[PDB]
Write a protein that binds this DNA or RNA. Structure first.
Length: 750
DNA sequence: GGTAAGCA
DNA sequence: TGCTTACC
């Protein structure tokens, strides 16, 4: 199977290399046959003989168009005649493009800034991570002797742990007596053993957690000072930093660096994204953290290292397990998109759709629209449309509730109303559907580019689901499940893609119309659910409704609910389908986007309320959860008021622990660009004053300390407490939190 | 990707 | 307001 691709300049000409892995043997495969090119649309096709002779320059030398062919393609469905300008080297494309645009007989030019190795994959129709191959995986993590004032790198690497399917060890240079620890002469020899372990194991994939930003760049700094070449690549080569977005990733030749941190952040939505937090949130069992302050003492003392070694071992072990679970999802995306895992694993869903289209656009002989210009991109940002409909809830406590939602609303709208730029407002098209409220016409004679592709996706997904039901072997059952999950992720990325400012196939009018149809079909079911079935729709948000027959018998509300979806689906066009999602014994609707329901088994789904927020104290979440609990389960509002008043005294007596006092707030900008200082900013601003590495995306916790003055300067880091203002955590957190529910019951501050 | 509730 | 985070 193909693991990666690249090119190298062999005496001025470009050579594609395919890093394969076939039946156990890893083998590089070269190719010199492939030619870089671009497209040029001419006003006068006779003026080709002039354009053929255009010439640029690069690093002193003179550059020209090696060849030219007249090809007929399509553009947004319509047939187009375009000339294919072949060059010699892919880095000639920037200079030639410029000079060809200037020409008056050239209208525009397309597919010019597509990386050369990616052309190869698309054009040759090759797909990474195909076929049956047992890839060797190896996770690893390091440990640094950090002091609070020290720069990045000055501290020695203390440990390097690595994990595997068979074993999981640690490598250090102090004397730790454990079966998994490996004692070594020095830092120098630690790094050396690591490199040997990598050569011995020979991993097809190297897994890490935060490798791109921390693990690898730290190694590099140390290996520089110790004069050691990090021979990690199969080419014998070192890890190379390669920019992909504004982000700077890390690359290893012949192997696949797989940083989990990127994939994780976009898959789930946890409070904090430390390795410890993520591990528990996936599997269940715990994993503690030993801080850099605690380890530095353990290094000087040299007696506490029994546990620090245990910590490092678990990081590698963790990373491997996490890695092992998140990989098949990511390798299936790579297989579906048709790009190397390394990129996919660091690629936004927007981009994933982009590349998916580019490939399919080739397969259909369609010329890809160009990226937006700087002005267009900016003019696209200052442009919007209305989104989903959200009903003001019928507030209060309600019995016997039902949830009904659409199966893949937006995909079904797209597919069945043929929504795409290549069908928008076509001239003299026979049949079309009009967009509600916004009035965009969509031709339905020939199925549009994107709609057509969603069809194939959902059809295949639909084929897998029926295959899973009917399959016997429980191995393929799991692999099927991953394919089907990947197609889902891609399938639901199209609506967002349409309004993505950097999108080649950006189509605001498409996005607007999908939304438009959404509201129509939801408001239909709404009016139809009450006026013809007697239900009372309590709340709505885009995709689904809550309903009930106020006072009615449980089993009747269910019986009629099933009947309503059986009737309404007959009224809905194409793929637009509604379903019976589930039943909830009670439900409490506070505001829009904020409510709680409780199933027949006793579990409570809380959405939007402080319970699931980061920027609220866990004492406020815990208290509020018990207030909800004691209202949803049964009317014990008497002890409910005692539950919260019991917490006021414990919070007053300083009897409540730390962590339950921590408030988390992400830093979304550079500290310089902040125009208004908050509490989480003032903490991270004074940390950076002591040389600490505060970057965007970093979620810090601030506990408020008892004093008097500004709320921001009184907040100290939550990671290290002071062995807090009781007025804040009561009157500005727990009380407001609990009030949100009890407000409807009429309670004041009591 | 738009809709929406909150804190000083 | 500036700001943050959740919802679909």
């Amino acid at each position: 199977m193909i693991l990666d691709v690249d090119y190298i300049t062999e005496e001025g000409k470009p050579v594609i290399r395919l890093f394969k892995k076939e039946n156990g043997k890893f083998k590089i495969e070269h190719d010199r046959t492939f030619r870089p090119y671009i497209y040029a649309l001419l006003r006068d096709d006779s003026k080709i003989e002039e354009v053929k002779k255009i010439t640029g320059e690069r690093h002193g030398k003179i550059v020209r168009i090696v060849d030219v062919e007249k090809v007929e393609k399509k553009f947004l469905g319509k047939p187009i005649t375009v000339w294919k300008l072949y060059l010699e080297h892919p880095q000639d494309q920037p200079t030639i493009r410029e000079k060809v645009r200037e020409h008056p007989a050239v209208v525009d030019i397309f597919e010019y800034d597509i990386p050369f190795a990616k052309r190869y994959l698309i054009d040759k129709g090759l797909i990474p991570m195909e076929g049956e191959e047992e890839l060797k995986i190896l996770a690893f993590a390091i440990a640094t002797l950090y002091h609070e004032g020290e720069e990045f790198g000055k501290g020695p690497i203390i440990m390097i742990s690595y994990a595997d399917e068979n074993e999981a060890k640690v490598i250090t240079w102090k004397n730790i007596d454990l079966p998994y620890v490996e004692v070594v002469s020095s830092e120098r020899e630690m790094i050396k053993r690591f490199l040997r372990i990598i050569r011995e194991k020979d991993p097809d994939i190297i897994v890490t957690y935060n490798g791109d930003s921390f693990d690898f760049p730290y190694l590099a700094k140390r290996a520089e000072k110790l004069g050691i070449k990090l021979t990690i690549g199969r080419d014998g080569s070192e890890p190379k930093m390669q920019r992909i977005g504004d982000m700077t990733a890390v690359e290893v030749k012949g192997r696949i660096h797989f940083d989990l941190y990127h994939v994780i952040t976009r898959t789930i939505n946890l409070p904090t994204y430390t390795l410890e937090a993520v591990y528990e949130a996936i599997f269940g069992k715990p994993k503690e953290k030993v801080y850099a302050d605690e380890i530095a003492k353990a290094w000087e003392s040299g007696e506490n290292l029994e546990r620090v070694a245990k910590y490092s071992m678990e990081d590698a072990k963790a990373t491997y397990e996490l890695g092992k679970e998140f990989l098949p999802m990511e390798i299936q995306l790579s297989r579906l998109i048709g790009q190397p895992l390394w990129d996919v694993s660091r690629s936004s869903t927007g981009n994933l759709v982009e590349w998916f289209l580019l490939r399919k656009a080739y397969e259909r002989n369609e010329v890809a629209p160009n990226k937006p210009s700087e002005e267009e991109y900016q003019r696209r940002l200052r442009e919007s449309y209305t989104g989903g409909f959200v009903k003001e809830p019928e507030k209060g406590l309600w019995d016997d509730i039902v949830y009904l939602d659409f199966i893949a609303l937006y995909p079904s709208i797209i597919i069945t109303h043929n929504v795409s730029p290549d069908t928008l407002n076509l001239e003299g098209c026979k049949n079309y559907d009009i967009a509600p409220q916004v009035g965009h016409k969509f031709c339905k004679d020939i199925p549009g580019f994107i709609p057509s592709l969603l069809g194939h996706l959902l059809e295949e997904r639909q084929k897998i689901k029926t295959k899973m039901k009917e399959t016997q072997d429980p191995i393929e059952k799991i692999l099927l499940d991953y394919r089907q999950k990947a197609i889902k992720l891609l399938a639901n990325s199209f609506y967002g893609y349409y309004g993505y400012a950097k999108a080649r196939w950006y189509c605001k009018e498409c996005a607007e119309s999908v939304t438009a149809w959404g509201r129509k079909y939801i408001e239909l079911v709404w009016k139809e659910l009450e006026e013809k079935f007697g239900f009372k729709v309590l709340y709505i948000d885009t995709d689904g409704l809550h309903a009930t027959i106020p006072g009615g018998e449980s089993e009747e509300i269910k019986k009629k609910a099933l009947e309503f979806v059986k009737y309404i689906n007959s009224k809905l066009p194409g793929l637009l389908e509604l379903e019976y999602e589930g039943f909830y014994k009670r439900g409490f609707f506070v505001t829009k986007k904020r409510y709680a329901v409780i199933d027949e088994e006793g579990k409570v789904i809380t959405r939007g309320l402080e319970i699931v927020r980061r920027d609220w104290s866990e004492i406020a979440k815990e208290t509020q959860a018990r207030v909800l609990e004691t209202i949803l389960k049964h009317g014990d509002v008497e002890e409910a008021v005692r539950i919260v008043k019991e917490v006021i005294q414990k919070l007053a007596n300083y009897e409540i622990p730390p962590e339950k006092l921590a408030i988390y707030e992400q830093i979304t900008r550079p500290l310089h660009e902040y125009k208004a200082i908050g509490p989480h900013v003032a903490v991270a601003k004074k940390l950076a004053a002591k040389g600490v590495k505060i970057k965007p995306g970093m979620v810090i916790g601030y506990i408020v300390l008892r004093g008097d003055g500004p709320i921001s300067n009184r907040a100290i880091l939550a990671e290290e407490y002071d062995p807090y203002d009781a007025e804040y955590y009561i009157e500005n957190q727990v009380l407001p939190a609990v009030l949100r529910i009890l407000e409807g019951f009429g309670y004041r501050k009591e």
